């Protein structure tokens, strides 16, 4: 198999285009057939400040970041971003994150964002 | 249209102490999930309903093994809604072999590949 590197993901916070009462969200991280998830946090600018480690042994494909609106009976996708593994930075240094725009006639477009750090060590 | 999904049970290849699994159902940007059940032949017998306005898409089914820090996917299938029949109640279900990963067409799932030895028993019908 491949030699193991640790993928360290810092789920910092998000910024949603909408009202406080409309978002109670969690973040799911999916990579290499596994997933880990934050707690749900209420608001337009939720803060999680949670770090995750994944043991990675191949550099193909990506890290999928999903932001979900929690519900009682079903959860609803807020949006998602995909981050190819190969160009995640190789460093032991925690970063502040980068702002990533989530992928979802006369209405204004809606753009939701997540602040996310990732680095290999 | 009202899609009804009966998540019946599964049969895994492996020792029973290795599994504490749940089923996630995704359709039209929503998701619902069963409870976790232990063993190599877990029974959930849980029925779900989804309001559909895109009959051209599919239902993604994922089986996950619950862990403390991370969860591991046991496998997945994608059922095109065009294959689901009309009925007024749940049938005994069909066995589907779980595949290891989705095929992505332009960032959207369009199928699955690489069969496992694991299977799930599912009923789906429209009402």
Give DSSP secondary structure letters for B36-62: PEESSS-EEEEEEEEE-S-TTSEEEEE
Pairing state between β A62-69 and A75-84: antiparallel
DSSP string, A8-41: EEEEEEEE-SS-GGG-EEEEEEEETTEEEEPPPE
Distance, in Å, from the CA atom of B86 to the CA atom of B15, rounded to the nearest integer, reads 37
- Residue A22 has φ and ψ, to the nearest 5°, of -90, -5
- Three-state DSSP at A58 gives coil
CA–CA distance, A21 with A8 (Å, rounded to integer): 31
Contact B120, B10 (CB under 8 A): yes
Measured between CA atoms, the residue of chain B closest to residue A77 is B29
Q: Cβ of B73 and A36 within 8 Å?
A: no
CATH superfamily, region B1-127:
C2 domain (2.60.40.150)
Token pair for residue A79? 């949006």
Please report residues of B whose CB lies closer than 8 A to that of A103: 107
d(CA A26, CA A41): 7
CB contact under 8 A, B29 and A76: yes
For B28-38, give one letter per residue: b (16+ CB within 10 A) or e: bbbbbbbebbe
* CB atoms inside a 10 Å sphere around CB B55: 12
Q: If you compute the radius of gyration of chain A from its CA atoms, what whole number of angstroms results? A: 15
Q: Solved by what technique?
A: X-ray
Domain A1-121 annotated CATH 2.40.160.10: no
Contacts of A82 in chain B (CB under 8 A): 107
Handedness of CA B32, B35, B36, B42 (dihedral sign): negative
The residue ranges of every structural domain in chain B are: 1-127
Distance in angstroms (rounded) separating the CA atoms of residues B3 and B56: 13
CA distance B56 to B77: 16
Q: What SS3 state is found at B18?
A: helix
Whose structure tokens read 């770090």?
A51
Residue carrying structure tokens 């789906």: B124
What's the CA gap between A18 and A65, in Å, rounded? 20
């Amino acid at each position: 198999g491949g030699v193991m590197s640790l993928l360290c993901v810092g789920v910092k916070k998000a910024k949603f285009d909408g009202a406080q009462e409309k978002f109670n969200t969690y973040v799911t991280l999916k990579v290499q057939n596994v997933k880990s998830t934050t707690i749900a946090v209420r608001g337009s600018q939720p803060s999680w400040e949670q770090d995750f480690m994944f043991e990675i042994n191949r550099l193909d494909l990506g890290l999928t970041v999903e932001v979900w609106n929690k519900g009682l009976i079903w959860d609803t996708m807020v949006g998602t971003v995909w981050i190819p593994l190969r160009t995640i930075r190789q460093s032991n240094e925690e970063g502040p994150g980068e702002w990533l725009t989530l992928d979802s006639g006369t209405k204004d477009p809606t753009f939701h964002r997540i602040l996310l750090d990732a680095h290999f060590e």
